[PDB]
């Protein structure tokens, strides 16, 4: 039986509003309702992996896993296996996979992060799951961020705390946070960003929603505006939104948005908003295609509607050769030539690089670079042709051209990373000097750039 080179992944996010679900939730897993929906001819075809994030989830793990498994079995006639389940108070992530994938999935990790201090600590935060699927690392984050139209900056803070502190994936990747540890990272949840229009416009907004005229509303969505100003989710993607706002509904219908201030809301307005979102970030030049992104119309127990997204995701096989794993393949080499980092830092330490990759036996430390002043005020760290020649464990181009090199630039004085990035080995040519580039981030914010040339030798 050949190993797959593609899988499909279902992402669901649903803020359940502390209510049990209705008896039928199959529309969710079928990507049926509003937005970019899945074709009827696919309804019996199981996704490879289902990742369900809930918020305000009132059920036990057992109660929810029985509902999920029974739902998928009814759709697909497949009994899914549980990869992982992790709950932080009423925030939960479930990962289910087809039985044939059980032997393909390993290195399963779970973690959570609680956001806030004192007053603001006790119910918001994130859960996450990571694992290997053959040669491919996958990470999944379900976050419930701070509520309220006025609190976008708090949400942005919650995002940075989650990507700093959530401990998933390979712990040897110590300079790297979750935004660099996975081939594919999916981040979803009740992100709680609102449509930032005046309160007095509530009925106008409702009118626009009834006319399915979302364009002007989306131009005021706080997550899209914060992302466009590089305040949050830097280097993540989101599919175009073509479904109505998923919050705040009167329960047991979808005919009414309940936006007016009430004692139960702390006297806050909840104008119709796209609270419930799915974003992703994949390594450069890896196949990832969103095939659905929408909301259900028939699940009405909560004041939120469920959101679905589905993806094609490229995956690679576990590779064994006669040499690696457990030695190098002297036919392979990676040379980084005429490289320089451009950093936003005002520090004057010396810097060294680390190169991390599952195509190396272990990470490689460079010599210190040569610091110069950039003509617009910046630090430029030059590495010349001084960089260590990297020795991959396998030289076969069918393996090596699918790999990635993570780069950290670290202070000699403190050994702290000032920036992290990723270079694809999916080159136009081997044995040929070719331009490379990555932005560098630290704690998910832009700190610089790395650019230069690469020369890749494979067994071909
Ligand atoms: F649904 C799932 C439940 C459990 C798992 C864990 N499988 C680990 C494994 C891999 C290879 C051989 C033996 C064990 C993976 C998926």
Swiss-Prot record:
This is Phosphatidylinositol 3,4,5-trisphosphate 5-phosphatase 1. It comes from the Eukaryota. The chain holds residues 398 to 857 of 1189 of the full protein. It is found in: Cytoplasm; Cell membrane; Membrane raft; Cytoplasm, Cytoskeleton. The lineage of its organism: Eukaryota, Metazoa, Chordata, Craniata, Vertebrata. Interacts with tyrosine phosphorylated form of SHC1. Interacts with tyrosine phosphorylated form of DOK1. Interacts with tyrosine phosphorylated form of DOK3. Interacts with tyrosine phosphorylated form of SLAMF1/CD150. Interacts with PTPN11 in response to IL-3. Interacts with receptor EPOR. Interacts with receptors MS4A2/FCER1B and FCER1G. Interacts with receptors FCGR2B and FCGR3. Interacts with receptor FCGR2A, leading to regulate gene expression during the phagocytic process. Interacts with GRB2. Interacts with PLCG1. Interacts with tyrosine kinases SRC and TEC. Interacts with c-Met/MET. Phosphatidylinositol (PtdIns) phosphatase that specifically hydrolyzes the 5-phosphate of phosphatidylinositol-3,4,5-trisphosphate (PtdIns(3,4,5)P3) to produce PtdIns(3,4)P2, thereby negatively regulating the PI3K (phosphoinositide 3-kinase) pathways. Able also to hydrolyzes the 5-phosphate of phosphatidylinositol-4,5-bisphosphate (PtdIns(4,5)P3) and inositol 1,3,4,5-tetrakisphosphate. Acts as a negative regulator of B-cell antigen receptor signaling. Specifically expressed in immune and hematopoietic cells. Expressed in bone marrow and blood cells. Levels vary considerably within this compartment. Present in at least 74% of immature CD34+ cells, whereas within the more mature population of CD33+ cells, it is present in only 10% of cells. Present in the majority of T-cells, while it is present in a minority of B-cells (at protein level). The SH2 domain interacts with tyrosine phosphorylated forms of proteins such as SHC1 or PTPN11/SHP-2. It competes with that of GRB2 for binding to phosphorylated SHC1 to inhibit the Ras pathway. It is also required for tyrosine phosphorylation. Changing residue 288 to E: In one patient with acute myeloid leukemya; somatic mutation. It comes from Homo sapiens. The gene is INPP5D. Tyrosine phosphorylated by the members of the SRC family after exposure to a diverse array of extracellular stimuli such as cytokines, growth factors, antibodies, chemokines, integrin ligands and hypertonic and oxidative stress. Phosphorylated upon IgG receptor FCGR2B-binding. Belongs to the inositol 1,4,5-trisphosphate 5-phosphatase family.
